[PDB]
Amino acid sequence: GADREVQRILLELLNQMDGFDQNVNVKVIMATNRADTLDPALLRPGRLDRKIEFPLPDRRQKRLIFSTIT
Amino acid sequence: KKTKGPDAASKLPLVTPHTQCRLKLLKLERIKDYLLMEEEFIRNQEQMKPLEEKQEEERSKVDDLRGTPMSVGTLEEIIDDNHAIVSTSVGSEHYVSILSFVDKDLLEPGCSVLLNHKVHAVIGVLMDDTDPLVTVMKVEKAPQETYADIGGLDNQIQEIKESVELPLTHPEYYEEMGIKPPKGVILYGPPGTGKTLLAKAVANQTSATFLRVVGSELIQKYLGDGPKLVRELFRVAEEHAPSIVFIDEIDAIGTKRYDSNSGGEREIQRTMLELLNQLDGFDSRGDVKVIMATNRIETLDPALIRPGRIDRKIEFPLPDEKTKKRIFQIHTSRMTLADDVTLDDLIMAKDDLSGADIKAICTEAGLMALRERRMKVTNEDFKKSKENVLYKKQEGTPEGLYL
Amino acid sequence: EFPMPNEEARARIMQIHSRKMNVSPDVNYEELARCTDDFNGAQCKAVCVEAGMIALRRGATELTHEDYMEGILEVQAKKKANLQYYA
Amino acid sequence: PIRALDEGDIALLKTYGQSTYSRQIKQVEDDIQQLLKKINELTGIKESDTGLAPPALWDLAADKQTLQSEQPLQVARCTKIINADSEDPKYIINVKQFAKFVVDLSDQVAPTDIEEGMRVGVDRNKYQIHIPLPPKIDPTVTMMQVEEKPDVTYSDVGGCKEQIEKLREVVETPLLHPERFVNLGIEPPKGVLLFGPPGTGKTLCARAVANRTDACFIRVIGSELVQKYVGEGARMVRELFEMARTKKACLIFFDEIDAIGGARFDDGAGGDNEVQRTMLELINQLDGFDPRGNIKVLMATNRPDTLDPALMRPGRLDRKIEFSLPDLEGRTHIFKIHARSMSVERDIRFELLARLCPNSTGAEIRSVCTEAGMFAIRARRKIATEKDFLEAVNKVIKSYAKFSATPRYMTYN
Amino acid sequence: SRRYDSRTTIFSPEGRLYQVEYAMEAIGHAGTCLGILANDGVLLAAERRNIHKLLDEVFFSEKIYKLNEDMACSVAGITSDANVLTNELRLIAQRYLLQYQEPIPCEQLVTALCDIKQAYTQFGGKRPFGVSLLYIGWDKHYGFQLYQSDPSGNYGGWKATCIGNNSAAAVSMLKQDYKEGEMTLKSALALAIKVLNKTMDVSKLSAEKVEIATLTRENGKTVIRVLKQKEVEQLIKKHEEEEAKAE
Amino acid sequence: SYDRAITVFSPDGHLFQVEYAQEAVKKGSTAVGVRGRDIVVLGVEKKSVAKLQDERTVRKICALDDNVCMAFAGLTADARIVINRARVECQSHRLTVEDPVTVEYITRYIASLKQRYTQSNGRRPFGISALIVGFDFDGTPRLYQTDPSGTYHAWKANAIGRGAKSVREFLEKNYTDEAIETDDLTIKLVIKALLEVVQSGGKNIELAVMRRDQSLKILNPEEIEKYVAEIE
Amino acid sequence: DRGVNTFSPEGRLFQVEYAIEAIKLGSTAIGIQTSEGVCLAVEKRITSPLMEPSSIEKIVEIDAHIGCAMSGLIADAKTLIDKARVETQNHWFTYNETMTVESVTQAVSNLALQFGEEDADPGAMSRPFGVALLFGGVDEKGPQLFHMDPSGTFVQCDARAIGSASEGAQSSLQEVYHKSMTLKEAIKSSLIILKQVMEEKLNATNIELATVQPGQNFHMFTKEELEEVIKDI
Amino acid sequence: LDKQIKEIKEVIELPVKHPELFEALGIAQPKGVLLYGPPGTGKTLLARAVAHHTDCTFIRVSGSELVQKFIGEGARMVRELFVMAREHAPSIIFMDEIDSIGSSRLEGGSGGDSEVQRTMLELLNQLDGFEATKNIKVIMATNRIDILDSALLRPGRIDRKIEFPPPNEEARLDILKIHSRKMNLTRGINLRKIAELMPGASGAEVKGVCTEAGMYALRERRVHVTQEDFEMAVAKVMQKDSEKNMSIKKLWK
Numbered sequence A: 001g002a003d004r005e006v007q008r009i010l011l012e013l014l015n016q017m018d019g020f021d022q023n024v025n026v027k028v029i030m031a032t033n034r035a036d037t038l039d040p041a042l043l044r045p046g047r048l049d050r051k052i053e054f055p056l057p058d059r060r061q062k063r064l065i066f067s068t069i070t
Numbered sequence B: 001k002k003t004k005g006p007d008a009a010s011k012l013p014l015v016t017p018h019t020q021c022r023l024k025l026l027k028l029e030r031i032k033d034y035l036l037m038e039e040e041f042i043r044n045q046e047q048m049k050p051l052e053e054k055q056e057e058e059r060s061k062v063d064d065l066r067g068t069p070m071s072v073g074t075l076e077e078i079i080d081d082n083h084a085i086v087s088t089s090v091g092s093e094h095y096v097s098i099l100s101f102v103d104k105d106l107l108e109p110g111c112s113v114l115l116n117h118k119v120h121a122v123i124g125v126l127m128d129d130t131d132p133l134v135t136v137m138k139v140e141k142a143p144q145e146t147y148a149d150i151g152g153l154d155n156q157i158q159e160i161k162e163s164v165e166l167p168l169t170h171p172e173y174y175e176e177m178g179i180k181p182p183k184g185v186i187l188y189g190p191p192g193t194g195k196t197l198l199a200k201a202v203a204n205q206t207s208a209t210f211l212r213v214v215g216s217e218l219i220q221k222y223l224g225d226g227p228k229l230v231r232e233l234f235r236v237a238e239e240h241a242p243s244i245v246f247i248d249e250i251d252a253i254g255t256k257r258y259d260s261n262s263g264g265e266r267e268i269q270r271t272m273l274e275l276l277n278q279l280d281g282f283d284s285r286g287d288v289k290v291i292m293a294t295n296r297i298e299t300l301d302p303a304l305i306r307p308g309r310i311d312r313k314i315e316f317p318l319p320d321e322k323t324k325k326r327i328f329q330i331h332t333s334r335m336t337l338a339d340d341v342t343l344d345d346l347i348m349a350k351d352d353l354s355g356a357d358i359k360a361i362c363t364e365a366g367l368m369a370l371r372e373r374r375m376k377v378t379n380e381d382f383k384k385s386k387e388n389v390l391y392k393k394q395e396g397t398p399e400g401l402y403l
Numbered sequence C: 001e002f003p004m005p006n007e008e009a010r011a012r013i014m015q016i017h018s019r020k021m022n023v024s025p026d027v028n029y030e031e032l033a034r035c036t037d038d039f040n041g042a043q044c045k046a047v048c049v050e051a052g053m054i055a056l057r058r059g060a061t062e063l064t065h066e067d068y069m070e071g072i073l074e075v076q077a078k079k080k081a082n083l084q085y086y087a
Numbered sequence D: 001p002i003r004a005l006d007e008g009d010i011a012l013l014k015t016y017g018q019s020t021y022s023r024q025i026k027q028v029e030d031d032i033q034q035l036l037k038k039i040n041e042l043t044g045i046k047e048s049d050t051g052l053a054p055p056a057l058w059d060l061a062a063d064k065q066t067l068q069s070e071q072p073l074q075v076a077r078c079t080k081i082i083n084a085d086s087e088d089p090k091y092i093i094n095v096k097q098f099a100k101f102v103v104d105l106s107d108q109v110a111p112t113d114i115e116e117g118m119r120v121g122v123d124r125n126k127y128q129i130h131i132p133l134p135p136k137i138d139p140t141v142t143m144m145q146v147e148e149k150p151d152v153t154y155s156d157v158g159g160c161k162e163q164i165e166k167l168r169e170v171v172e173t174p175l176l177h178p179e180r181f182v183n184l185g186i187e188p189p190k191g192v193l194l195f196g197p198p199g200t201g202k203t204l205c206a207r208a209v210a211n212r213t214d215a216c217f218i219r220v221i222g223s224e225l226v227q228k229y230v231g232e233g234a235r236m237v238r239e240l241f242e243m244a245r246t247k248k249a250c251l252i253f254f255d256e257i258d259a260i261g262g263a264r265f266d267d268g269a270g271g272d273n274e275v276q277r278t279m280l281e282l283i284n285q286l287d288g289f290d291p292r293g294n295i296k297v298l299m300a301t302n303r304p305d306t307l308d309p310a311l312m313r314p315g316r317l318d319r320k321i322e323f324s325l326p327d328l329e330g331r332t333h334i335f336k337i338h339a340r341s342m343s344v345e346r347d348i349r350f351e352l353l354a355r356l357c358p359n360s361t362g363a364e365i366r367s368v369c370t371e372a373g374m375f376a377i378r379a380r381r382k383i384a385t386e387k388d389f390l391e392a393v394n395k396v397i398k399s400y401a402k403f404s405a406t407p408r409y410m411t412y413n
Numbered sequence E: 001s002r003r004y005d006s007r008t009t010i011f012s013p014e015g016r017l018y019q020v021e022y023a024m025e026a027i028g029h030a031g032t033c034l035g036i037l038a039n040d041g042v043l044l045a046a047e048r049r050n051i052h053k054l055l056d057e058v059f060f061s062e063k064i065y066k067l068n069e070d071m072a073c074s075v076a077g078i079t080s081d082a083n084v085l086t087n088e089l090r091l092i093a094q095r096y097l098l099q100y101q102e103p104i105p106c107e108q109l110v111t112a113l114c115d116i117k118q119a120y121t122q123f124g125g126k127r128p129f130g131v132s133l134l135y136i137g138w139d140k141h142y143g144f145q146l147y148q149s150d151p152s153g154n155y156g157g158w159k160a161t162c163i164g165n166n167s168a169a170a171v172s173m174l175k176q177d178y179k180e181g182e183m184t185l186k187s188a189l190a191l192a193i194k195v196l197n198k199t200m201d202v203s204k205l206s207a208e209k210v211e212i213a214t215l216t217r218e219n220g221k222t223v224i225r226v227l228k229q230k231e232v233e234q235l236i237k238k239h240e241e242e243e244a245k246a247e
Numbered sequence F: 001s002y003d004r005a006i007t008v009f010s011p012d013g014h015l016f017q018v019e020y021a022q023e024a025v026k027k028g029s030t031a032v033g034v035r036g037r038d039i040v041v042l043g044v045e046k047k048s049v050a051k052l053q054d055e056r057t058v059r060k061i062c063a064l065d066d067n068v069c070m071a072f073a074g075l076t077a078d079a080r081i082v083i084n085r086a087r088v089e090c091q092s093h094r095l096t097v098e099d100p101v102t103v104e105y106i107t108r109y110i111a112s113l114k115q116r117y118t119q120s121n122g123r124r125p126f127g128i129s130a131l132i133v134g135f136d137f138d139g140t141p142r143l144y145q146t147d148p149s150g151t152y153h154a155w156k157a158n159a160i161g162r163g164a165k166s167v168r169e170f171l172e173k174n175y176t177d178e179a180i181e182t183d184d185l186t187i188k189l190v191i192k193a194l195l196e197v198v199q200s201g202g203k204n205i206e207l208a209v210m211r212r213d214q215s216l217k218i219l220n221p222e223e224i225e226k227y228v229a230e231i232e
Numbered sequence G: 001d002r003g004v005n006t007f008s009p010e011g012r013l014f015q016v017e018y019a020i021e022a023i024k025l026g027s028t029a030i031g032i033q034t035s036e037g038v039c040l041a042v043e044k045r046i047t048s049p050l051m052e053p054s055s056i057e058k059i060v061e062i063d064a065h066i067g068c069a070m071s072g073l074i075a076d077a078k079t080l081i082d083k084a085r086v087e088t089q090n091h092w093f094t095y096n097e098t099m100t101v102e103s104v105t106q107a108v109s110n111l112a113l114q115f116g117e118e119d120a121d122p123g124a125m126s127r128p129f130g131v132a133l134l135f136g137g138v139d140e141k142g143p144q145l146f147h148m149d150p151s152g153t154f155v156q157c158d159a160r161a162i163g164s165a166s167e168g169a170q171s172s173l174q175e176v177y178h179k180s181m182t183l184k185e186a187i188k189s190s191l192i193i194l195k196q197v198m199e200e201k202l203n204a205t206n207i208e209l210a211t212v213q214p215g216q217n218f219h220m221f222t223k224e225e226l227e228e229v230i231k232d233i
Numbered sequence H: 001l002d003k004q005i006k007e008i009k010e011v012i013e014l015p016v017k018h019p020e021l022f023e024a025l026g027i028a029q030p031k032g033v034l035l036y037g038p039p040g041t042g043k044t045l046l047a048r049a050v051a052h053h054t055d056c057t058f059i060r061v062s063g064s065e066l067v068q069k070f071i072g073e074g075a076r077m078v079r080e081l082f083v084m085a086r087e088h089a090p091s092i093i094f095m096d097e098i099d100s101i102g103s104s105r106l107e108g109g110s111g112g113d114s115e116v117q118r119t120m121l122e123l124l125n126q127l128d129g130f131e132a133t134k135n136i137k138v139i140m141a142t143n144r145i146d147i148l149d150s151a152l153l154r155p156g157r158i159d160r161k162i163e164f165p166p167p168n169e170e171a172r173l174d175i176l177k178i179h180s181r182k183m184n185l186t187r188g189i190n191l192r193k194i195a196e197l198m199p200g201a202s203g204a205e206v207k208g209v210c211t212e213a214g215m216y217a218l219r220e221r222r223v224h225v226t227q228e229d230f231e232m233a234v235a236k237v238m239q240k241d242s243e244k245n246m247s248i249k250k251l252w253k
């Protein structure tokens, strides 16, 4: 108890994202380092769908970033 | 006056045979006949007896003197015979004159007092200020059940009958020894084992003014309104004649007290304290008897369960063998069972089978019957219900640990 | 800061809230202070009046050191009963 | 393979079954249901508009005299006076919740009859002053006096002699005989808080005192001490103590003070805020830079551990009294007291039931004496017997409603 | 010190050994081991949980350990806990051989180990052996046999059983489709493969994630073998064809 | 060497760990033993045959000696251990006293073993209650019950484990010299008692019988079925 | 937490206090010392009619002149009885005499409270014995009656009752006992008090009675004798 | 799901559209239906279906919506809900994920949630209490059937408990067809293999394989998804994290 509250928040998020409302118009973007530790309900389709990898920069990436920042 | 306002019900003296039969037809016809007779007579005598010289000119005078939109206000320290102080809903202390129509008696401090709108003047007394949130807890359409509907709970029914019915049925039996009749029984037991059924049974043959509560509706959001709704409830109970108040699901306002840190879990504690104080404290308690139902008797704060406030703790258990067959008989009657669906078999097997389970098996059994297009239940229609009603339950020890 | 009466503060308070009784000179206020620890001030006024209360209850004229001691045991609600074991 | 149900299927199902007179039965039942509504509608709830004195006892005056009462005698509004400018007829008043004002004194009332702090009858329209109003005595505050004598004497409070003597030493003697407390000059302890397990007579002794208080015994209905609007509770307690300091030897009982008192904290919603404020006002009144006087406080609780320290310390409550479970003699006396009105056989040994009811309380002793003749009423006798009482004990306490230790459990011999 | 003590061997308020039943929960997650007793031999089949392109193939098995010339067992739990018990079993068997100059009966060997397991549950303050074993063997007293044990130190003989992940599903299938007293070794292998197929929900039997051993008496001498890849694959092909024929 | 005080008094005068072990004895199976005029019978209600389990290795009745046997109800592993210690002691007494052990003596030893496990350091109370029957040298039949508490007693009959009290009440009202008049009546007496607890009957209760001279005998399923039919 | 050897704010051991409390649960036992001898009685408290009342032995013999009555954890009483018997025989073997009642009790008491947890022994006792022994016997000093509480405290007493009815059994013993009482008078008075405290009607099957006299050895009354006394009592 | 749909219809349709039949059979009308389910395999779609096909008067309640900070406001809302339902004749309430006002009663004190417990109690009483609600039916859907309380799952409040299983292969083919009948499939798009390529799917991942396929199609600004497109979509959708550091996996073995 009092730790069930995080569960309540997650459940409300799941309901709003895909529940008996089908908002349709609104999109949702979430960011969280590490995705292995997540609820499968919030990871399945019909919810946050496309998982985008944001890797540590490669050799080419470093060059482009250094150019654009200096 | 202490009016013993009954449930204002029982308009169905109860048709004796339940099997569709001309006996049923004739009896219900007699019922309708008397009802129509009553309607006719009342209408006819209302129309006849030309007392049209009514209104008792004088009462018309009184109504004339007490204008339109009269206001409800709280009487206060009464100053003089022909003068008193009133407090309107805004809490403004006007100084009004008690007119002659008001009986100088019955007007005590704190009694809601009617007023004239323009010139604040005590015009009449009001003896019905029951909180509109409390009057909604008086049962006025008695639930349709009888002690015979419930089965297999003899010992556990006689105990309630000896503290909700007999004490007002033959009270000489009690005084002859001088023992004060037991007041307040807590019906604790596992889920779906009666409890509410016995409550409704005792409601039926009430002979009293049953008050129903919820166990959560008492809790209120305004500091103090909690420990005043209960006060109003029991004030109404004692004002009305012998009554039994069923505080169902007392597990809600009953949690063992603790040195808390929140505010809500202190207001609830204050509510329980009000309950305790009034049920057994400096005061008394007339013919008011309290029935409490709970699923967990171990959680109730020791206090609300004490042998001076809640005696005769009944122990409604999971139904036993014979009681199971009795309940099946009582809950399978009004169905056209086949000749090979004797229930003497579905009993046994699982050691966990409650009355709610039994009624579910009996209902999802007829529903199963209405799937092969038949209206006579079948043994397969019953053996296919144990696998569809009783499921999802937890299990026990791993075989091998013991035999 | 008003820290709890250590032991000499306790003795002095016991004396101060007294001297309106027929107290006998034979009372080791230091030993009383030793016995009474964590007693927050007015807890004396309590104890150093309950002493006289008990003295009156018994039927007597003068306060006694054991009277003070019984008052001390009393002011904590504790009760002294001769136990059946000491071995 | 569960094919649905077709409309024709339902139609046939509704008509293949024994209903010789069943359509009529349902129709007549519906007619009865619709007829009850008509009957009650036409005999609805009336004759409930009471509040009318019988214009027969004063029937003669119950007439135009009333109108004469109306019209003249303008209805005034209550209000206090915060100043009265000397030699200047102007006054300043604070009505109550509306606002303040400057008022002139009506000619009908001499200025001397009107003072500072008294309640004036200001009129509407132009706020002028008229017949002054006597000091208020609030209804909630005045509805607390015992004004009766509950039917419980000290004798019936059995099983505890030391406790009763302790209580008497502070609640009765220090007021009914000041002599003993002067010869020694011992300040009578004031403030007795009663502990005890749930149900031991803590309220029984409080009631017993009321039968010989020979003074006011205001009973604090703690639930009333808390109200919605802030400051209401503090004012309630202040008026309580102010009426306290108006008579001789007033005793004020705070039954179940756990409701109003509790450890302070600012974590959860700042604590109760208002409730804690009322508790603080009570503490200040009990002890502070304003000597109380001749008012004593008795309070009872089930758990003293949950009381605010500033209230458990001496000064506010001196004579703490344990109310422990009765001893053997206590139990015997308690049984005797709650058995003297029972049709019990003479040969009953009550010294044995006492042993057979260990660690029980007074409420349990009652629930055993009762529910003892209840088995006799079940057997339809008239004089209960020792066997009946013993069965009652075994069915009430010790084993009460749950006896798990039974199957081959005889290890204590 | 009292404060840091764990109190592993103490009774739960309702009459239960928490560390014991818990230790059984740990055994629910282990690799699936399936043993079937036939009229001619006994067989153990174990789901090979470890399968990776880099693990090398070492030893004659990874879960099937030989105890005597006429015994073998499979484990399901912690190898560190399992390796301790396997070593003790071999010592117990050889100690009996030294004393009596006759191979230890299967029932007695199981009882000896089960006696050790009970001890850890009673005293010492040490955590229970969270390992469950299936023993197969032959002896002159009762012929072919199959036994099971649990961290509770309790054991029982069976004609076919499984332990580990999806045990319940296997025993159900085994209970339904086991022919007591008329099952040859081949049918036992076929039943094992079928039970293994459904039990591994993850993927299907590739003939590598399964290791099978069979105990048989040949020329008066007990023979313990671990089926090679060729026959394991051959069995798998045979089962697949049978499934197709049914459908 | 772990030497912590596992079982230690608690307010109001009780030993928790002893109580808790007692419930563990309750949750077990139901076992019933009766002392006849010249026969002592034990029975047990089997939770589940399981249709695969080999009934040989799940015997819950065993012989401590040629003239002593027992039945238990509780943790199996605790039961197997206790039986081994009793068996070795029986041989040791035979070695020294040169006479067969007595039911009273072995009961005292087993009881003394349990008593040493509650009070000891770093140990757990044995989770079994044992019913010991046997014929002493004089021939008088004997029946003894031992609880985990170490207390042992002599009975005409009693029942342990799940469904104990109800069965015992059945035994109390139905036990008589007439019921103990004949060996068959004793055996049927047992079965009805178990049937008071077990449901299936005939196939769910294992029965054993000990006579004055003959050693322990386990009734065959056919014999149990025959007796059940006779009762019906 | 709260080791067995712990001190309360009053200086009271927790375990010793609890153990003494457990005594109350046990059945009643009455022991009266008289110049003619020492008598013991007890309540058997039969749990169920099936149980054989012969196997509930509440009065045992330590030697030919020493007897004991028990109450409390009867399982705990067993080890205490065994130590007493061994000590008695060891004393006879070495000194060729009979140990006095006080000496035996002192030996038994020295066993009570010899418990610990750390650095005590491989299998030492952890907790205190919850049983109250009434030692009675005849020595060179004449009849002797010693009561022992769980605290290891033994103190000769003229008449005492232990058990659930101790409070009130003692009270009755107070009103009747006197120095010149004879053995028969002690036996009857003991039987009455046991009858009063015993809920169930007192008969010959539910009470164990024994006596030790200067002439005779320890004697446990048989059913025939027990019936005779209760017939008049 | 077709058996499940029929089962739910027998409790939300039959006893409300054809009342007399139940009385004629002499049985008590059912009330209540709880739907289990793996992460996502239905629910909240049969819910909309029953809302969109039945002219009763659907009344929604989310999970964390009856929870109100002020004490008691979390029960007055439920009482008002049921009063409104009774005022609105045939009605059905689909309590969505209901672990929120649910779970199992915790021992009280300052060591757990209590006000949510009181709301659960109020709902329980109003579902089956002193008054027998008539013509009101409740639908409750919530994962983790094993965490609910022993009361809300007592046969008599939640009568029949539909079990939603993860789709079989035959059902997965149906799901793919139903959620693909708006996409221009090419010639040779063998849905059978594409369905059998998804073992133990969720029935919502089917609409990841049938949507990320079109998302692939968008990249080539074309239409006519192809079989390689669907295969890539399945490989891109059904990628569970798995495990690493075989030491932990090598811990049970």
Ligand SMILES: Nc1ncnc2c1ncn2[C@@H]1O[C@H](COP(=O)(O)OP(=O)(O)OP(=O)(O)O)[C@@H](O)[C@H]1O
Pocket: B149, B150, B151, B152, B153, B190, B191, B192, B193, B194, B195, B196, B197, B198, B293, B295, B319, B327, B330, B354, B355, B356, B359, H128, H151, H156
């Ligand atoms: N022994 C019984 N005989 C007849 N009906 C029974 C019996 N036990 C249960 N029932 C039926 O079970 C149904 C479920 O409601 P019931 O009043 O029994 O629940 P309850 O025990 O009050 O439940 P709760 O634990 O939720 O308060 C009732 O309609 C009642 O008629």
Ligand SMILES: Nc1ncnc2c1ncn2[C@@H]1O[C@H](COP(=O)(O)OP(=O)(O)OP(=O)(O)O)[C@@H](O)[C@H]1O
Pocket: B280, B281, B308, D156, D157, D158, D159, D160, D197, D198, D199, D200, D201, D202, D203, D204, D205, D302, D326, D334, D337, D338, D361, D362, D363, D366
């Ligand atoms: N020692 C006693 N002697 C006689 N009667 C007693 C004794 N103790 C309790 N009672 C009886 O117990 C009954 C119930 O007591 P009651 O619950 O009103 O008060 P209380 O024990 O102070 O408890 P509470 O904590 O609820 O205030 C009283 O009517 C009283 O007669």
Ligand SMILES: Nc1ncnc2c1ncn2[C@@H]1O[C@H](COP(=O)(O)OP(=O)(O)OP(=O)(O)O)[C@@H](O)[C@H]1O
Pocket: A014, A018, A019, A041, A046, H001, H037, H038, H039, H040, H041, H042, H043, H044, H045, H097, H141, H142, H143, H175, H178, H179, H203, H204, H207
């Ligand atoms: N059989 C099916 N056919 C088609 N679509 C389906 C099927 N089953 C589920 N879906 C899809 O599932 C999606 C909704 O997910 P779901 O029904 O599992 O929600 P939910 O029950 O609220 O789940 P959760 O348990 O995660 O809260 C919809 O996009 C719907 O198309």
Ligand SMILES: [Mg+2]
Pocket: B211, B212, B213, B246, B248, H130
């Ligand atoms: Mg109600």
Ligand SMILES: [Mg+2]
Pocket: B280, B281, B282, D202, D203, D255, D256, D300
């Ligand atoms: Mg009180």
